[PDB]
Structure formats: structure tokens, C-alpha cells
Symmetry: C5
Subunit: 273 residues, 5 copies
């Protein structure tokens, strides 16, 4: 059976198949994912007036990201259940090509919304000092797009061409390091001339950002993090990848948005928190 | 046939199958469930302005839980009708593995929204005295997460390994007892320095909370509450489990939210009821 | 063919099948049903501020019922088209058990929202005199639940056990008569000490309530209202039942809600009719 | 192949089948239809505050009609693609009875919302001089209902019984002429005592109303407007019917609603166009 | 096999089929498309109050376009995955006629919303000088309709009749040039009597408009832009066409709407950027 430039989920599914626990867990974690995003959409809309007018764009951009993430995770939850079907003889779920092959690439192109908007929205809460707004925005958006597109190309080859997978991944990582660099400056400048309570929130935002964003390259490498024929090149690695994505999605989008909202409240003249 | 680590609904469905009443009732009760949650979402949004600004976060968190519960019960309603198909020869509904096995685990991971948010929202209505907000929140969220995850692992073994089922269930129960303990403190402190009308509502909330939350471990054990080859290890137990879930869902999420809203009104300077 | 405890729609569908007109009409009338409810949801939300704050809960409860009725009629519309499939050889639609048997019981459990909320909402518009709010509410909700649950059990036996059908129906009818009794008291007390305009609307509400609610037991009996092998034990009775449900649904939920809104306007100090 | 009392789309589909252009166009025009209605729903809600309070009910009733038309055209768009399936051997789309026969009757029962509400809403913008509001409303609603129900019965016989088709159509046309008569009076009285700009809009509304509403009986007769075995008794007539419906739907519901909104603005003390 | 007047996607799909990358990418880019539009819908609604009342109609018309584009791209995303199915033997996705042939014509008829509304909305932000509002609107709408309808007819013949394809395309292009001419006048008059900041935004809008709108005829010609049996008459051309549509959709609808919003803010007495 030729699968070509397909994600490793399809190779595990076509050879060993998935146990009840592996198949059900992956469905459950994607379902939790899209439920969090629709709940988050409601939260960010309903709390718009908790902050001064100038900060409300951050709530709006959080809502924009919630719409993207809800739609994508809802679609992927259906893609999972469509791509793997129970075999009564062996009692496992095997690749069902009539559902299409499963592909994580759905996430990557939707990041062309998420990444630009997540990076942009902090610039509506913090005030820059030494950095120029337009310059930070342009660097975030350029490096964001390049990081996503190079990684997108890479993940198609995660089984078919390990070399292409690692080279494209390495190129993507360079743009990622640039984003980390710029965001660190933005957090530092944001701390300047605000209450200590605001400064503490920005310290928390930086840690959240660094960990949550690093989880995505972690999900990229997941199948090979225990090397060739390792523990993770298995249904266990399939489960781990979607779990890491869901932790990263909730952390990078919802918790990030909530912390920015809390910062906006502290910076708001009327509001106290 | 080989079903592995699957819920007992699939064993009943694959051996005896379900009568018209058992199959239809389970579909009906899940449909009522998701209808209550979407109706509740509308209620919590439309009543936001019935309470002082400081209490409105409770309405918002109720709405967040309604989104989670609606999405999950809607999905599970479809999962039920997909997993069991009419056999014309015998006139009963039998396991249809092309629909996937039925799994209650969908509920468990979505509780990672419901439980944390339900426990959190009371802290936006009552005032603590001796207990610290952040400390109560952290205990609720840590013990809530551990209770859910341990029970989640357990329910996969409810047929395949009764020992694992009972041990994981027992560990989960310990975290549950801790939650009951902390919530009792919160209700007691909440009663201090408020009107007798408010105190009565908090007394009602405690009883509602204790009964509604205890129904979940009840649903966990349901198939075995009449022992080996008991009355409940049957389509009658399948019906009973989803009925208990729906009573618990409506009670723990909607009625809880309504009572908290009514408490917020009594604590609101402008508002009266 | 063995259908067990199934609604008579399935017996007609499995024996005679449905003509184009019978099949299409039943689909059309259910589609009109769910369209009216979603349109009504929009109407009740958009007119909230047309009445004094104290009356707005009636708009909210109308909206809650609209959500329930929309969801249920939308689901039942799909259930109808799934349960009956065209046979090319004879040119009629026959029972397709792969879609599941058709069951009116979906409506019954959703009445656990509709009935309690419809009975409750009038208590936010009229003022009681001799009766206590909590007492009327409790009687409405207790007798409402018992009426629904006993009728729900009954309708499963409408073909398989005419005796059980009529006995459960009779028990349900007793609870219905109690509801009619309590609602008559509520209307009488509501008329006391209000404008003639208000009194006229309450007279209209009583007639609407009495006729619209009585249509439901009419739908229950429909197949047998022309006796054994009568005109209505046919596709014509199948059509008649869903037509009566749709007239009852629109009358009891939407028109009732509109009249209560109009009553609220007349009782509103700020608002004018 | 026995189709019985079915619309002519099914006879063309079962005999000649549909070319790529005929099948795709019909799908496209229904898709445009439902898109216009959901976009219109948003427009009528967002512009509510552009007119004086007394005129806002017209926006609300426009929104109500948008909900009905969106739901119906969305359902019919799916019904079209379900009822006709590609035959690879000849490269045409043929009747697929597993999808159900296609029926325009879906539209007719939903007109029980559209027609009453479209006729009603003008009475919240114009002021009558000779005519009583309640009397005009009752005439519109009675004649609207009778026009719809008689036409609904007729269209089932458009192939099976040309005589029934034409007689029911003729009876329906009588009620239609009554509606045209009453609406002409309403427009004339509406022009009395308003600005010339308002009078011009009402002149436009009358022309729009007369043409857009006459398109519906045009769609009814479409297959036979070129006589027996004429050009229109073909895939070309199938296309023409749905095109005429979509022009009529957009004109009678959206453009009508926009012109009424524009009239309301001119009659509004605060507002100007 | 015989495909008749069908888009070239179906010819590639039926002969060579699509690689994993070609099939998945096309699905991903359409998914991004509809996600951007629903996120944009939320953005345009939530930012309505960021501009003076007189400019808010531009936000409303942006929202209207978002509804159209979301619905269309969502439907087309499903049409793509329905029209091509994995062949296990060769590991490619081939035409699945049971899903219907794929057709870009869905986009064209929905442009009867998008094009008229996009051209109209600028007239609620800029002030004309020498040109009449009604005259510019009428020219936009007439030439817009003719451009769309002629191109719509053309694209059905892109394989079956290259001559019809190029002639209808040429006629469509003439109406397009007229639109470019009128929009240039509108931009010029719009620049008169506004701040240099406003003039810069209008310069950007003109460039965006010219490039984004020209991408549509580019997508029309895509398969033949490398001549007969060129590189683009392939899965690579299929990918390129949907990529160009998505870039054009985001640019012409969302970015255009955002720039108009930014212009409205600069022209707003209360607000500043
Ligand atoms: C598994 C992870 C579950 C994520 C939890 C909720 C998701 C829904 C989003 C709602 C976020 C609510 C956060 C909150 O309640 O914060 C209030 C804030 O402190 C006062 O402004
Ligand atoms: C997140 C992604 C981070 C990428 C990690 C390392 C990139 C190292 C640079 C690329 C070096 C190529 C190594 C290689 O090609 O080894 C494959 C081997 O031949 C088996 O077939
Ligand atoms: C079987 C389950 C049935 C559940 C029905 C679904 C309920 C949804 C929310 C309805 C909430 C009920 C309304 C209560 C409002 C209330 O508590 O009283 C008003 C308050 O005092 C301010 O005036
Ligand atoms: C095996 C049997 C398991 C028994 C576990 C029982 C209870 C767990 C209680 C743990 C709760 C402590 C969590 C940490 C915490 O929340 O600390 C408080 C907060 O940090 C202060 O600010
Ligand atoms: C937080 C605490 C985490 C620790 C959990 C250990 C408890 C896990 C209990 C596993 C039970 C295994 C078992 O019962 O095995 C049965 C055997 O295979 C034949 O019956
Ligand atoms: C809610 C959850 C509360 C359940 C707590 C009940 C008992 C916990 C004690 C651990 C039980 C371990 C005994 C294992 C056992 O009973 O095995 C029977 C049989 O041999 C295997 O099929
Ligand atoms: C055994 C087979 C025969 C069965 C035939 C049944 C006949 C039922 C007739 C009337 C229902 C009256 C029920 C009483 C309603 C109780 C209301 C209630 O529970 O609320 C009390 C309220 O609080 C006050 O203070
Ligand atoms: C709405 C439902 C109203 C039902 C009215 C029937 C009255 C009494 C039924 C008593 C049971 C009689 C059963 C004997 C007939 C039979 O079983 O044959
Ligand atoms: C058979 C041909 C009948 C065609 C008659 C056309 C006029 C219809 C009704 C007028 C009734 C006036 C208003 C009715 C209010 C009740
Ligand atoms: C109830 C409505 C009654 C409608 C029944 C009349 C149908 C009709 O006109 O009959 C057609 C003809 O008998 C067959 O071709
Ligand atoms: C005012 C409402 C009119 C009510 C009933 C009129 C019934 C008359 C319409 C029935 C016509 C049926 C018909 O034309 O039958 C022709 C026959 O089938 C060819 O052979
Ligand atoms: C809108 C409803 C139109 C109703 C009646 C118009 C028909 C009146 C004209 C008389 C019909 C007789 C007829 O056309 O006969 C058919 C003949 O078989 C073909 O050659
Ligand atoms: C076959 C090759 C195609 C040739 C390419 C044609 C391009 C120009 C088309 C039309 C120009 C004028 C059309 C204007 C249509 C009416 C709108 C209008 O100008 O009227 C406004 C009214 O006067 C209120 O002020
Ligand atoms: C009016 C434009 C009509 C153009 C039709 C056309 O170009 O047809 C070409 C012909 O089919 C080439 O064989
Ligand atoms: C802005 C986003 C766009 C990104 C999407 C990329 C898709 C590339 C599309 C077109 C390039 C091809 C231009 C064609 C120029 C070559 C002409 C040619 O090859 O000659 C024709 C042939 O030789 C005579 O028979
Ligand atoms: C919610 C969406 C977010 C925050 C997306 C973030 C995505 C990344 C940080 C992706 C990074 C990658 C690498 C650093 C290397 C491998 C390829 C990527 C794109 C997964
Ligand atoms: C609406 C969601 C709610 C209130 C969820 C509550 C869940 C529980 C209280 C679960 C408790 C469990 C045990 C104590 C033992 C067995 C495993 C669990 C997780 C079902
Ligand atoms: C919109 C929902 C409403 C108003 C539901 C009303 C339901 C009833 C009045 C049901 C009555 C019944 C009987 C009195 C006898 C037979 C069984 C029932 C439940 C259909
Ligand atoms: C959007 C809904 C509208 C405006 C509905 C209008 C429907 C009609 C004017 C129908 C008229 C008919 C006749 C006059 C004869 C044939 C049967 C009808 C019902 C199509
Ligand atoms: C978002 C929708 C937009 C902006 C649509 C624009 C459509 C066009 C500019 C279409 C132009 C065409 C030609 C100039 C020639 C070929 C046929 C068309 C219709 C694609
Ligand atoms: C799944 C493996 C990746 C986890 C990365 C943890 C974050 C560390 C960066 C500081
Ligand atoms: C002025 C009143 C007449 C309006 C015109 C309506 C035309 C209806 C005919 C339907 C179109 C047939 C196309 C073949
Ligand atoms: C930085 C992390 C990258 C480490 C690369 C590890 C090389 C993995 O090696 C690969 O493992 C697969 C599954 O085990 C095998 O099927 C492949 O044949 C093999 O190339
Ligand atoms: C704390 C409540 C747990 C009670 C444990 C009951 C033990 C049931 O025992 C189990 O019952 C099943 C169904 O009858 C049988 O199929 C199994 O063989 C048997 O092990
Ligand atoms: C309306 C309340 C009383 C109704 C009782 C009517 C008795 C119905 O009688 C039933 O009729 C069915 C269809 O005709 C038959 O198939 C059954 O054999 C017969 O028991
Ligand atoms: C007012 C318009 C009514 C005209 C009705 C006359 C047309 C009836 O002609 C019908 O045409 C069908 C297809 O062309 C044939 O299949 C039928 O046999 C024939 O009766
Ligand atoms: C202005 C751009 C239009 C250029 C028209 C080029 C003519 C293309 O020629 C066509 O190429 C197809 C694909 O290779 C072939 O299948 C056709 O047989 C051939 O007619
Ligand atoms: Na599956
Ligand atoms: Na598929
Ligand atoms: Na089923
Ligand atoms: Na499946
Ligand atoms: Na069907
Ligand atoms: Na089924
Ligand atoms: Na089709
Ligand atoms: Na079907
Ligand atoms: Na596919
Ligand atoms: Na199909």
C-alpha cells in the first residue's frame, strides 16, 4: 500500500492500527480542543467592556483567533474519525482511505491567521519604547509566514523523506528564534513605566509564550523524539502529538488572551482587577 | 467479537442488542441534554445585566460551561445513533462498529472545562473570609484535573479489567472528597456577612452540589451497582447511566448557575428579586 | 417484520409505504415547524426592551423555549427523511431501518423544557392574589413532569399494547386536567385589578392555551380517532399527527409568547401598545 | 419508473438527466439564494437603530423572513445535490431516488411565514387613511394562507394531473389578485401626507411588489409556458424555474425590506438618507 | 470518461489523479479561506463603533461580504473533498463522480453579492466631488453583473470549447476595465479635501484593488498560462488556481475592508489611528 508524502498517523493506522484507547483519546482531545476555542470565543466577546476602549482590539483579535482555532479543530476532529475505522476481526481502528489520509497540515495554513494575530494583539496592550510599532509588526508577520510555510512543506515528508523533513524544520526554526527574539524585546519594553502588577503579568506571558510556542516544533518532531523504531513511532506517539497540540493551542491562544486581558485591566484607568 | 478496553454499552449492544425503548430513550435523553445546555447558554447571556458588574463574570463562566456541555452532548447524541443500528431479523439495535465504539470518555476530557469553571465561578459571587482566593482556585483546579484524569483512565477498563476500574475509581474518589471539603469551606465563608435570603441560597447550592456531583461516580459504577450479572448489567443499566448523566449535567451546570445568579441578585445593591 | 414497541408511522411505512404527497408533506410541515421556532427566537430577543425590566424574563423564557423547539423539530425533520426511503419499483417511501425507526418520543422529553418554562413564564407577567408564586410553580412543574413521563411511556405501546397506551394516556390526562385547573386560577387572579386591555389579552391567552395544549393528547390518539382500520390508521393519520403537532407547537410556544409580550407592554408604565 | 404526484424536475432527471451546466447552475443559484438571505439577516439586524423606534418592527420582521428563507433555501440546495447523481457512462446527472424526489413544496409551506410577515411589515412604516390596520392585516393573512395552501396542493399534480394543477392554480390566483388589490390601497394611503421622496420609494415598492410576487405563479407554470413538449419542458425549464424563484426571493424579501428601511429613514424625525 | 462542459480539475482528477500534497493543499487553502471570512465577520461587527455613525454602513457591507464568502468557501471546501477519493492501489486521489464534478462556478454567482457590495461600500467612506453617488453605484452594479455572468458562462467551456472560453473571457474583461476606470475616478475624488494620511490609505486601496481583482481573471486563465500541455495543465495548476483565489479573496474582501475601516477612523472627528 503506497501512502506517498503522508503523515506517520496513516502508516501506524495502515500497519498496526489503533487500540480503542488510542483512537478514542485522539478523538476526545481534539473535541476538548474545539470546545475550549468556542467557549473562549464567548469569553473574549463578553469581557470586551472590562477594559478601556484602546485595549478592546486585543479582545477582538483573541476572538478572531478563537474563530480560526474552533473551525480548524472541529474539522480535524471529524477528519480523525473519518480516516480510521474499526476492524471487527482484530478489534483495532485501521486507515480508511475513503475518509482521506489524516494530515496535520490543516493546522499549519490556519496558523497564517493565528500566529500573525497572536503576535499583533500584544501591541494593542503594551507600549513600545525603543522599538517601532510598524517594524515589530512587519518582523512578526514576515518571520511568522516563513516559519509556517517552511514547516508546512517539511511535515509532508516526515515519513517519505526524513532529510527534507529535518532541513525544512531547521529553516523554520531560524524564523521561530527571530520571533522569540522580537517578542522578548516587546515584553521588556512593555514592562517599562507600568505598575509592578502589570510587570508580573508580562513576566508570566513571556514564560507561557516561550513554552506554549516551543510545543509546536515538539509536535513536529514527536514521532522521532525516541529515535528510529522508538516508543513514540507508534499509536502512543500519535496520541502524544495531538495531546501536545491541544495543550499548546489552549496555552498559546486562550490563556495568552486571558493574561493580556488581565494586563489591559491593570493598565485601564477605571478598572482595578 | 474482540472489543478490548471498551465501555459496557458496546458489550450489551454486541450480545443482546437494544430494544426500541432502550435505544430511543438513550437518544432522547442525550437530545434533551444538549437542548438544555443551548437554552441555558441563551439564559446566562440574556441575564448578564440583572446583577452588579462584579458578579457578571459568574454569568460568563456559566455561558462558557453551556458551550462545552452543548458541544459535547450534541456530539455524544450523534455518537449513540452512529454506534447502534437496527437488525430487521430480530428487531433490536446492535453494535455497528463502522460508527466507532461508544465511549463515555468524551464527557471526561470536556470536564477539564466544566469542573474548573464551575468551581471557579462561585468565587466571583461569595466573599471568602479566612481562605485565600488563589489557594482555593488552585486546590479546585489541581484536584479537579486529577479526579477527571484518574477516572478517565479507569472507565476504559470498566469491562476489560474490573480491578484497574475500581483502583483508578478509588484514587479519583480521594480527589473528589478533597473538592467537597474545599467547597464546604467556600459555602460557609460565603454565608458570613450576607442576608438570610443569600444564606438560604448557599445552603441550597451546597445540597445541589453534593447530590449532583455524586451522580457522576454513580454513573461510573452504574453497570455493577446490582453486582455481577445484576439487573443493571443490561440495556436498563445503559439507559440508567445516560439518565443519571443528564440529571447530573442539568443540576451541576444549569440549576447551579441559576442559583448563583439569584445569589448575585440578592448581593447586588441596585437589583432585587 | 418485527418492529416491537414502535410508533405506528413505522408500521404504515413498512406495510403500505408513503405516497410522494404523504412523505413530502410530513417533511415540509416539520421544516416549517423548525423555521418558525428559529424566527421566533430572533423575534423574542429583538423585542426584549419593548417591556419594563420586570417583564423581560418572559421574553427570555420564550427564547429558551424557541431554542428547545428549534433543535427538536430540526432533529425530527432529519429523522423523518432518514427513516423512509423511495422504492423505485412501487414509487412509494418505505421504512429504512438503517435510519432508525421514527419515534415521536423525541418531542416528549424536550417538553421537560417547554412545559415547565411555558407555565412558569406567565408568573413573570401577571400578579397572583390568593395563590403563592412558589406553590403554583411547584404544581405546574410536578404535574407537567408526571404528564410528560406517563405519556412518554404510553406512546411506545401505541401499536404493541393498546391497553398500556390507553392506561398511561389516562394517567397522563389526569395530570393535564390539574395543569388546566391551576392555569385557569392563574388567569383569573391575573385579571384582578388590571386594565381592560390586559383582561382581554388574558381571555385570549386562556382560549389559546386550552385549545393548543389539548392538540397534544389529540396527536397521541390520532391513529385511533377513526377507530380500528379507520381512515386515520394510514399515511393520512401520519400526516395529520405531524400537522397537529406543528399547529400546537406554533400556537402553544410562539403565539402564546407574543400575547404575553403584548400583555407585558399594556402593564408596562413606560411602554405603550 | 413510477414517480406518481412528483414535480417535473424528477421526470426530466429520470429520462434525459441533467448536463453539467444545468445541474451545476441549479446548485449555484440556490447557493446564492441562501447566501443572500443570511447576509440580509445580518444587514436588517445591524441597521435596526437607523430608524425611529416605531419603525424598528419592520427591521425585525425583515430579519424573521431572512431566517425562514435562509433555512428553506439552504435545505433545498442540499435536496437538489442529493436528488441527482452523475452517471459516468453518459456524463449526465440522473434522478437518485435514495436522495428522495425533489419537491418545490418546501418553499410553499415556508411562505406561511414569508407572505404574512412581508404583507404585515409595511403596516409598521406607512400610515393608513381610510383603511383599519387590523382589517388590512386580517385580509392579507387570510388570502395569503389560502393562496399558499391551494397552490401547494396544485404543484403536486403539475405532471400527474394537469387539470388539478390548473384549477388549484386558478383558485390560488384569485386570492393573489385580492392581495394585489389590498396592497395597492395600502401604498396609495401610505403616499398621503408624506414627503415626495417617501412617495417615490412607495411607487418603487409597488412596482417591485407587483413584478417580484408575479414571478412565483410564473415559476409554478414554468414547465408549460412553451406549451406541451415545449423548450421549457426540459433541463432549461428546470434551470429557469429556480432562477425565477431566486430573482423573486431576493426582490420580494431583501430589496423590499431595504426600500421599506429607506422609507422608514425618510419618515424618521432624527434620520436622513 | 465523458465529462462534457466541466472544469479542468475534473480532467486532471480523472486521468492522472492528485498526489497527497496536491489534494491536501487544495483542501487546506479552501479551509484557510472560509476561516479568514468567519474571523473577518466577527472583526467587522466588533469594530462598528470605532468609526462615526455615517461610516458604519461600510463595516455592515464588509460583514455582508464576509457572510457570502464564508458560506461559499465552506461549501467549496466540502465539494473538493467530496469530488476526489483516494485509490489505495496507486496512492492518488481520483475523480469520484458520486460527489458531483468540482466547479468554480459556485464562486461566480456568489460574486453577485461580493462585487456589487465591495464597489458600493467605498461610497460610504469617501466623498465624491464631480461624480453622482447614484451614477457611480449604477455603473459599478451594471458592469459588475455583466462581468460576472459572461465569465460564468465562459468557465464552463475552459476544456470543452477554448474559443467560447476566450471570447466570453474577453467580453467579461471589457466590463472589468470599465469597473477599474470608475473605481480610479472614485479614488481620485475621494482624495480631494481629506488629510494626507487619508490620501495614503486610498493610494494603498487602489493598488490592493487593482492587484487583488486582476487575480480573478488570472485564476480563470490559470490552466493555460503555460500554454498547451504546459506545467500548469496539471495538479500544480489546480493548486495554483485555488491558491490565487484564496489570496484574491482575503485581499479583495478582508484587507480592503480593514483599509476602508482605517480610512473611516482618520475621517472620523472623534477617533484617530
Ligand atoms: C483544559 C483547559 C480548560 C480551559 C478553561 C476554560 C476554557 C474557556 C475559556 C474561558 C476562560 C475563563 C478564564 C477565567 O475565568 O478568568 C477570569 C479572569 O481572571 C477575570 O477577568
Ligand atoms: C524542529 C526541527 C528541528 C530540526 C532539527 C535538526 C536539523 C539539523 C539540520 C539538518 C541536517 C540533516 C540531517 C539528515 O538529513 O539526516 C537524515 C538521515 O539521513 C536519515 O535518513
Ligand atoms: C429538564 C430541565 C429543565 C431546564 C430548562 C432549560 C433551562 C434553561 C435556563 C432556564 C432558567 C430558568 C429560569 C429561572 C429564572 C429565575 O430563577 O427567576 C428569575 C430571577 O429571580 C430574576 O428575576
Ligand atoms: C493516592 C491518594 C491521593 C490523595 C490526594 C488527596 C487530596 C489531594 C490534595 C492536593 C491539593 C494540593 C494541590 C496544590 C495546591 O493547590 O496548593 C494550594 C495553593 O498553591 C496555595 O496557594
Ligand atoms: C496518581 C497515582 C498514580 C498511580 C497509579 C497506580 C495505580 C494503578 C492501578 C493499576 C491496576 C492494575 C491491575 O489491576 O492489573 C490487574 C491484572 O492485570 C490482572 O487482574
Ligand atoms: C467510584 C469508584 C469507587 C470504587 C472504590 C471501591 C473499591 C476500591 C478498592 C480497590 C478494589 C480492588 C479489588 C479488585 C477486585 O475487586 O477484583 C474482582 C475480580 O477478581 C476482578 O475481575
Ligand atoms: C394510581 C393510578 C392513578 C393515578 C391518577 C393520578 C391522579 C392525579 C390527579 C391530580 C394530580 C394532583 C397532584 C398533586 C400536585 C402536587 C403539587 C406539588 O407537589 O407542590 C406542592 C406545593 O408546593 C404546595 O405547597
Ligand atoms: C389521551 C389518552 C386518553 C385515553 C382515554 C381512554 C380512557 C380510559 C382508558 C382505560 C383503559 C381501557 C383499556 C381497554 C381497551 C383495550 O385494551 O382494548
Ligand atoms: C373560490 C374563489 C375565492 C376567491 C375570493 C378572493 C377573495 C378572498 C377572500 C376575501 C375575504 C375578505 C377578507 C376575509 C377576512 C376573514
Ligand atoms: C385536505 C386537502 C384536500 C386536497 C385533496 C385534493 C387533491 C386533488 O385535487 O385530487 C387530484 C386527483 O384526484 C388525482 O390526480
Ligand atoms: C375556496 C377553497 C376551494 C375548496 C375546495 C374546492 C375544490 C375544487 C378543486 C378540486 C379540483 C380537482 C380536479 O380538478 O380534478 C380533476 C380530475 O382529476 C381530472 O380527471
Ligand atoms: C397561475 C395559474 C393559472 C391557472 C389557469 C390558467 C389556465 C387557463 C387557460 C385554459 C387552460 C386550458 C389548457 O391550456 O389546456 C391544455 C391543453 O391540453 C394544451 O394543449
Ligand atoms: C461587448 C463588449 C462590452 C463593451 C464594454 C462595456 C463597458 C461600458 C459599459 C457600460 C457603460 C455605461 C453603462 C451604464 C449603465 C447604467 C448606469 C448609469 O450610468 O446610470 C446612472 C443614472 O444616470 C443615475 O445617475
Ligand atoms: C456572444 C458571444 C458568443 C460566443 C460563442 C462562441 O465563441 O462560440 C465559439 C464556437 O463554439 C467555436 O467552435
Ligand atoms: C500573487 C500570488 C501568485 C502565486 C501563485 C503562483 C502561480 C503562478 C501563476 C502564474 C505564473 C505563470 C506565468 C506564465 C508565463 C509563462 C508563459 C509561457 O510559458 O508560454 C506559453 C506557451 O509556451 C505557449 O504555448
Ligand atoms: C495557535 C497557533 C500557534 C501559536 C502556532 C505556532 C506555531 C509554531 C511556533 C511553529 C513552529 C515550527 C517550528 C519551529 C519548526 C517545525 C515547523 C513548525 C512550523 C511546527
Ligand atoms: C458537568 C460536569 C461535572 C460537574 C463533572 C463532575 C465529575 C465528577 C465529580 C467525577 C467524579 C469521578 C469520581 C469521583 C470517581 C469515578 C471517576 C469520576 C471522574 C467520574
Ligand atoms: C410546546 C410543548 C407543549 C405545550 C407540550 C404539551 C404537552 C401535552 C399537553 C401533553 C399531553 C398528553 C396528554 C394529556 C395525554 C397523552 C400524553 C400527552 C403527554 C401527549
Ligand atoms: C418570499 C415569498 C413570497 C413573496 C411568496 C409569494 C408567493 C406567491 C405570490 C404565490 C402565488 C401562487 C399563485 C398566484 C398561483 C400558483 C400557486 C402560487 C402559490 C405559487
Ligand atoms: C471577492 C470577490 C471578487 C472581488 C470578485 C471579482 C471578480 C472578477 C474581477 C472577475 C473577473 C473576470 C474577468 C475580468 C474575466 C474572466 C471572467 C471573470 C469573471 C473571472
Ligand atoms: C514535547 C517536547 C517539547 C517540550 C518543550 C518544553 C519547553 C521548553 C522551553 C523552555
Ligand atoms: C407588470 C406585471 C407583470 C410582471 C411580469 C412577470 C413575468 C412572469 C413570467 C415568468 C418568466 C418566464 C420566463 C420563460
Ligand atoms: C531531531 C530528531 C530527529 C531524529 C531522527 C531519527 C531517525 C529516525 O529513523 C527513522 O525511524 C523510522 C521509524 O522508527 C523508520 O521507519 C525509518 O526507516 C528511519 O529512517
Ligand atoms: C463497588 C461496586 C463494584 C461491584 C463489583 C461487582 C463485580 C461484578 O463482576 C463482574 O460482573 C460482570 C457483569 O455481570 C461479569 O460479566 C464479570 O464476569 C464479573 O467479573
Ligand atoms: C381514541 C381512543 C380509543 C381508540 C380505540 C380504537 C381501537 C383500535 O383497534 C386497533 O386498530 C388497529 C388499526 O385499525 C388494528 O390494527 C388493531 O388490531 C386494533 O386493536
Ligand atoms: C397556462 C399554461 C397551461 C398550459 C398547459 C398545456 C401543456 C400541457 O401539455 C403537457 O405537456 C407535457 C410535456 O410537454 C406532456 O408530457 C403532457 O403529456 C402534456 O399534457
Ligand atoms: C491567453 C492564454 C490562452 C492560451 C491558449 C493556449 C491553448 C491551449 O491549448 C490546449 O491545451 C490543453 C492542455 O495542454 C490541451 O488539452 C488542448 O488540447 C489544447 O487545445
Ligand atoms: Na472512525
Ligand atoms: Na471521502
Ligand atoms: Na442508529
Ligand atoms: Na464512522
Ligand atoms: Na428519505
Ligand atoms: Na443510521
Ligand atoms: Na448530486
Ligand atoms: Na436519503
Ligand atoms: Na476525498
Ligand atoms: Na453526491
Amino acid at each position: 500500500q503506497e501512502l506517498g508524502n503522508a503523515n506517520f498517523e496513516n502508516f501506524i493506522g495502515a500497519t498496526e492500527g489503533f487500540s480503542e484507547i488510542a483512537y478514542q483519546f485522539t478523538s476526545h482531545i481534539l473535541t476538548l480542543g474545539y470546545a475550549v476555542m468556542l467557549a473562549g470565543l464567548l469569553y473574549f466577546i463578553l469581557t470586551i467592556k472590562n477594559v478601556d476602549k484602546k485595549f478592546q482590539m486585543s479582545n477582538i483579535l483573541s476572538a478572531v483567533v478563537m474563530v480560526s482555532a474552533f473551525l480548524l479543530l472541529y474539522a480535524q476532529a471529524q477528519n480523525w474519525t473519518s480516516s480510521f475505522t474499526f476492524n471487527e476481526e482484530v478489534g483495532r481502528y485501521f486507515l480508511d482511505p475513503s475518509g482521506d489520509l489524516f494530515n496535520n497540515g490543516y493546522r499549519y495554513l490556519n496558523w497564517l491567521i493565528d500566529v500573525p494575530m497572536l503576535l499583533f494583539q500584544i501591541l494593542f496592550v503594551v507600549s513600545l519604547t525603543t522599538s517601532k510599532f510598524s517594524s515589530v509588526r512587519n518582523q512578526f508577520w514576515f518571520s511568522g509566514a516563513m516559519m509556517i510555510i517552511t514547516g508546512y512543506i517539511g511535515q509532508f515528508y516526515e515519513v517519505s523523506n526524513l532529510t527534507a523533513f529535518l532541513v525544512w524544520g531547521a529553516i523554520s526554526s531560524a524564523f521561530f528564534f527571530h520571533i522569540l527574539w522580537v517578542m522578548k524585546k516587546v515584553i521588556n519594553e512593555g514592562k517599562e513605566g507600568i505598575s509592578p502588577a502589570g510587570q508580573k503579568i508580562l513576566s508570566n506571558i513571556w514564560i507561557l509564550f516561550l513554552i506554549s510556542w516551543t510545543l509546536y516544533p515538539g509536535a513536529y518532531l514527536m514521532p522521532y523524539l525516541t529515535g528510529v523504531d522508538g516508543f513514540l513511532y507508534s499509536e502512543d506517539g500519535v496520541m502524544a502529538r495531538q495531546l501536545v497540540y491541544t495543550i499548546a493551542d489552549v496555552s498559546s491562544k486562550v490563556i495568552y488572551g486571558v493574561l493580556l486581558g488581565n494586563l489591559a485591566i491593570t493598565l485601564s484607568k477605571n478598572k482595578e482587577l
